[PDB]
Amino acid sequence: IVEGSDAEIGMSPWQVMLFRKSPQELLCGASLISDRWVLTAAHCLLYPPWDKNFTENDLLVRIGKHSRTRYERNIEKISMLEKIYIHPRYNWRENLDRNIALMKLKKPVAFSDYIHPVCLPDRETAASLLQAGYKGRVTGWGNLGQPSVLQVVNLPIVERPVCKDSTRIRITDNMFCAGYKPDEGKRGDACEGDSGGPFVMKSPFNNRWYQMGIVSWGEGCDRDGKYGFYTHVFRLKKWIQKVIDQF
Amino acid sequence: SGEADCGLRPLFEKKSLEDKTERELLESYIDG
């Protein structure tokens, strides 16, 4: 996260951090959608160009964390993964279309004041909140150099035509872009390290937080005038349900 | 186990407390 502010304790209880087992290294963000299922981006797990093809046993996730450098005794929880599921139509060679993946925790995590699931959007919430100008939220650690505590940034969804002209890659309806114009009316943004993390919005109707998107591709914290893309969660909801209901 | 209690934060919505910037999001949602 760049140009963001310090998040408050328990402000993003669904935030999940994905780590490489050995050597230990933070790889991506992710989100808790139930006591045993975690949502993230497919490129966080599978990206051939960089020789990335992780298996369940190469990773682990930490949940309920606020500080990146200090251990939070009796607060944060660690979990191994039982299975990883990548969308079969995930396109890593072109536009990262359907850049989504699910990870099943080996053992269910206990919910607490610091660990709580985010909602998956329903049709009405998606139709209602997914509008240009409306702001969503992304959280992650600083790699602004790095951070102490979790960072937060609120970004406006961008007009589809503007998103299309910001990149030469072929965008699809399964993705949307968000961010402030390069001229600076504001300027926070998600970075490479926030890949896979959730883009959430709060429904004014029922006061609940919904994960509308998944942070897609990023390199460092610079997009050279471009906008970050997000996987459209509602559009891929049936796939998520298919995977969970069967496994 | 969220489907029912999902999206309601124990330290915020559950305690009738708002975080520092959620206002920014809610104010951005115009047309209805």
From Swiss-Prot, chain B:
Origin superkingdom: Eukaryota
Descriptive protein name: Thrombin light chain
Source organism (scientific name): Homo sapiens (Human)
Name of the gene: F2
Residues of the full protein shown: 331 to 362 of 622
